[PDB]
Design a protein around this ligand. Structure first.
Ligand SMILES: Cc1onc(-c2ccccc2)c1C(=O)N1CCN(c2ccc([N+](=O)[O-])cc2Cl)CC1
Lengths: 419, 424, 424, 422
């Protein structure tokens, strides 16, 4: 069954790939051009639009980068998609690209103005993964949406509050409950769900739950979804994604990025290694991850959004094509890591006992040892019980790329906020 | 004409694949056994023997490998060849296999002892491409034979000066002449050929030309030819070779190896990666290629022959089976490159005039600027002029395995350290 | 006399500037018409014929452009020039405009016919700076000339020879001698100069000397000489050149261009960006400069002459003005850099003594050791000594346009894909 | 016998080490202070002087570096030396330290002023390894001296000739020099210089000529990794058995020993530490006139020319200010190790390539070997033209991983990471 998953995940990939090759045949792009992320993005944005068309395609002519603006029938694209997915409409593949896009968004744009607009805390952006994704996304879509995104969506509904949209509010309530780990938080979601007239109090509870999820974090899916051009390149190399299988959370995407080759258009003022960092973060869904953890896995320093030289991957219609040069996106990384759904809630040893007289801190597991009527106060009780020093994922590490089955972990010894 | 040569090579490869599949049925071989390079080798060796029989076939019982010799009527194997080839005799396909064998040989053994035996330098082995291959290889075989191989065959005929076979000597001289790129070298062959009774005079001219081929290199074809089991696997999978076409010199063999599965028997001391280096090199006619270039294409390091722990792919009759392990060969590569006939030999600006005080190198096309009666000493003059640091194949590059039409050349550099340059 | 060269340079620039303005008023040219490079060229071309008339002048009338072939008195323009320069002949100003035209030519035309007519290698176009420049140019004009230009002038004489024209030959031999950076090249020009009977040997020695100038590069002045409209537009804007000073190799021409406004007529098949690449290079004496370097200084890429879509700045009299349009030339750049006179030549240890048993070449300085003799062989050896990879102008880099004094250099780190640096 | 060598080389090391520990006990230096190269150098310079005394010893007191100036009887030191070398005078050990010193000199000082003084070419400094070594050095001393050093020494004698037992002294030095040359021709030329009964100006010219030839047709010259005594003393104090383990000057041992060692240097305020590190490291592996590209490779950081270094030189002058003197770690580790050779590398198996792939690159061949298609001066000249700076020597030799104890898998570099230290 783990082998079953890998087979249909792999067929999903094989499809996107096969599609992409067909778009590089139509458009008569060279292998270089097909590997331009900007081109990749337009092709992805075309097929997504086709199932809801065109956009900028970039050719290299006389050593310079030419933007053209192509158009196509949604009907032809929708057929090519089916052809490449072997008859099927294959909605998983569409969703995959949607998640890659959102991951790119989460890493490109700070969603602050949209947060105050909803009467939420502008500093909550770590909870916001998946915010630019549509509500017309799959089970996989909801998996990927962060607690914040969920809370914002339910607030939008309550704010519009002052039939069929009752289930829409209850289902989203459910999804949100499904994200919480603690008994208490889960019960609070029920009280908000069960409310027949969702007033201001319901709003406050959501704002309160949102805030709680900064400390008592939510279980949120992380998937490595790469630009279509990556997959198309792999398929064109003869790679059998169905027969080999593939996983979004394992080694596969890291392994695939080691030997891949993507190029980006880069604005004169911009620093390439930075445009590389942006894209890399998007690829492994790591915009609200520990910058220290990112830097470790990558093997160069991942630096905050305010330190980047990059104006953002996609290129504006009014921008000048004359100053536009391009370069390699450097997408390899020293190690790989499994990605988890969990936020990591806090037998085997809890403490140390010093053997050697040597300057150092002396570890112990503070939560586990420190285990020596309103829902709001119970949640408050736990948040004080937590300190930013508590270790989660005890006994988990990164791996050598040579470590195909993940047998020998590597734990690092280390602000660290991207935004 | 190009779209139909593909169609016919397609047809040829197809037959090998079909024949191999047929032999795998004939011999009731497991999926794993049919892909074992050693089994492939015997199957190939048998068809060639039947068209001038049996050989060893390896089977895993109880986990441990068991070899058993097998005998087949030469007439019966000939029948299977012709069936898998829709009736036609498919000599091209028998030649393809012969070349694969010749490529494997080139990569496995130094051709030193037979070199001193003829009158030639042991340090001429970079010129011995296809010295294992017979004269029973056609025009395809002639192309693949290197400058020194030719030279050796003419010296063997001369040293049998101790009619209808005169014209054989002429034809061979023409092939040899056809490989030289300087006219000076060609005029000298046109001074060996017409010599009606050749003895020491012509043998001295040939050694000189052979020696000259080390610097002013001849044009020798390189063809990627894979072991029959790979083609068999690709046929079994539903790749119609005849319809899709196939090139020996383009992406097709590289793409075929990326996605194939070939196993090999390994002796207890041997390193599987090193064995995988031997097969890879063989597949791509790369025995006498700059190791630095091989490595770059391959994506991992390609090391010299005397740093390799391999006795050779073949298993000799006396070998201990009980101690024999097997493993998957690493035949993949990071990039690909067109295989060439070329030897490399060499208006508008040829240099730069610095306008600005800016730190940089000042490029200039060195070999051209540097380019500025007896035929022997004419060659020497050109030889003295040649510098090993001069670049050839200007603008030609490697390609991504997705780059079918060779659109986007990647021009490498070899700063990523290696283990030599000469494989010998 | 540090700032004193700068004041007299700004004297000439004010000069040309005042002359352009006064000439616009007298041709009654609108401000847009006035800043047109084609009106600039004809106005420039008129003073120079006058001190040795007409040419086409262009107007926007009824929305489109109309050429009018106007004729003014040589004697009257000669008078206008004088009172623009406060009485003086001030021939320095005249030389300036000649150099500007030469740099445009140098960017515009491949001198391939011109080179072969002379029995020179057509591949010598890099050595050709100031080929269209007359002998009637100053010592300013002599400095700007390339090694190959000088060799050509000398070959034309020796050829014309198959009194006081002898002192002419000898003068040119000395001009050339001073461009040479090595003592061997210098001595060899002196053997040419001292020749009792200038014939074939001297032709052969010059050809050899030109060839050596490709690797062992001559020293050639690069001066940034801009169109007269550019200077006239700053002097129209009350900018005081005699006050502020001016350099031809300093920041000032880059500074002037960033603030400047220059238009050009563009044919409907012509790319505006390509026309403006050409003018830009001519503005900075940059025809034979490494494209990598030119590109880095400008920001936007500088392509080879064969990828450009322009047939020149001047318009042929048979060309139709109805389909003719015009736009603003991109004369700006991302950075600025100093212009050298030098062509970058590349005590203490002269050899290595190996410590480690490691595979490598064992460097030694072959010219210097072997120098312990015929002049050709001394030169060949120094040429063989040089590699295209050798770095020149160590420590020297480009500056931010704000950075007015040369305080903080930017040393560029140049691409792995490094071929195609030659504009012709 | 290879095992025999390692045993007595090892005993030699063990001795220096044991001696050094005894000097750190007397002087009551802390483990830190004993690992100061400057202290190491004074201790070494003391025992060398004793057998021909004192000098500056640096203590760390209240966080600052104090120079004192100690004195001792040559008699006491000479006894400590014998005690540590277990009765023996053990002259090998003395010579070892002398070579480390010369190696340090060859990397510190350019010997140019001393070259013109001898009427030799000021650009010959690559031939000058061992020049500051005394003529009172062993067989090991002579091994280590470069052709130039030898030529300079014979010129000094000829120059004194125009102003008995010094006849053998001139002939033996002649012999040593002949022993360094590889080519038949160069060896014969040395004989003509030896056999001359009245060594005039012509003899001088021949030596000058031979010296110059040895820039291209290089001399066989020994390279030995001789480390500061403190390195050894530290190893011996760690309980390490140099006799039982054995040791080699040209193999992995010195690289292996520097990987886990720890030396500190006093560093002048203006100076860059990583540079002082480079100086010492070069000295340690005898690599002052080696290919800077080769050095940089083996080390794993860039080794940069003598004119790019921030360093004023290891030993500290009496008049220098102790107040601005800070100190740091000498970083002496290296990415790889390499065998050191005696040879200069004179130019079966393949001589050329045959391109398989259409790819931009140079196409190698072995120029000398292929180009093999009555005065001694002209014969030598014939060969120097026959040579080009591109000729590869040491075909099929490489560096090794430190993990590669027996040297089984080589690594050949491709050079782009001049290349002359001076
Ligand atoms: C092109 C290309 O497109 N897809 C791949 C690829 C795709 C999935 C997994 C691995 C490689 C790929 C590729 O270039 N490689 C990487 C180099 N490569 C390789 C991969 C793995 C190993 N290895 O870890 O033993 C050794 C090698 Cl030489 C062959 C496949």
């Amino acid at each position: 069954n783990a082998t079953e998953i890998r087979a249909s995940v792999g067929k999903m990939i094989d499809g996107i790939g096969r599609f992409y090759i067909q778009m590089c045949t139509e458009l008569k792009l060279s292998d270089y051009e097909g590997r331009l992320i900007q081109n990749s993005l337009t092709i992805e944005r075309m097929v997504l639009s086709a199932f809801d068309t065109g956009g900028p395609i970039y050719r290299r002519v006389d050593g310079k980068w030419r933007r053209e603006l192509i158009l196509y029938d949604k009907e032809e694209i929708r057929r090519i998609w089916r052809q490449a997915n072997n008859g099927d409409d294959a909605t998983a593949g569409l969703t995959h690209m949607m998640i890659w896009h959102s991951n790119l968004n989460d890493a490109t744009y700070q969603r602050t103005r949209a947060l105050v607009r909803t009467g939420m805390d502008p500093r909550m952006c770590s909870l916001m993964q998946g915010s630019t994704l549509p509500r017309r996304s799959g089970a996989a879509g909801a998996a990927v949406k962060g607690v914040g995104t969920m809370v914002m969506e339910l607030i939008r509904m309550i704010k519009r509050g002052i039939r069929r949209t009752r289930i829409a509010y209850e289902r989203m309530c459910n999804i949100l409950k499904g994200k919480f780990q603690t008994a208490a938080q889960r019960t609070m979601v029920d009280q908000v769900r069960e409310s027949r007239n969702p007033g201001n109090a319901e709003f406050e509870d959501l704002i309160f739950l949102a805030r709680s999820a900064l400390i008592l974090r939510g279980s949120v899916a992380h998937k490595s979804c790469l630009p279509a051009c990556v997959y198309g390149s792999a398929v064109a190399s003869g790679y059998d994604f169905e027969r080999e299988g593939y996983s979004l959370v394992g080694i596969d995407p890291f392994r695939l990025l080691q030997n891949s080759q993507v190029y980006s258009l880069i604005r004169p003022n911009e620093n390439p290694a930075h445009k590389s960092q942006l894209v890399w973060m998007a690829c492994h869904s790591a915009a609200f991850e520990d910058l220290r953890v990112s830097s470790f896995i990558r093997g160069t320093k991942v630096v905050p959004r305010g330190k980047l030289s990059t104006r953002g991957v996609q290129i504006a219609s009014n921008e000048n094509m004359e100053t536009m040069e391009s370069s390699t996106l450097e997408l390899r990384s020293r190690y790989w890591a499994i990605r988890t759904r969990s936020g990591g809630n806090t037998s085997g040893q809890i403490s140390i006992q010093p053997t050697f007289s040597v300057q150092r801190n002396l570890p112990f597991d503070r939560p586990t040892i420190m285990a020596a009527s309103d829902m709001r106060t119970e949640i408050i009780r736990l948040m004080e019980s937590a300190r930013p020093e508590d270790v989660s994922f005890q006994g988990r590490g990164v791996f050598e790329l040579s470590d195909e089955k993940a047998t020998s972990p590597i734990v690092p010894s280390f602000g660290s906020y991207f935004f």
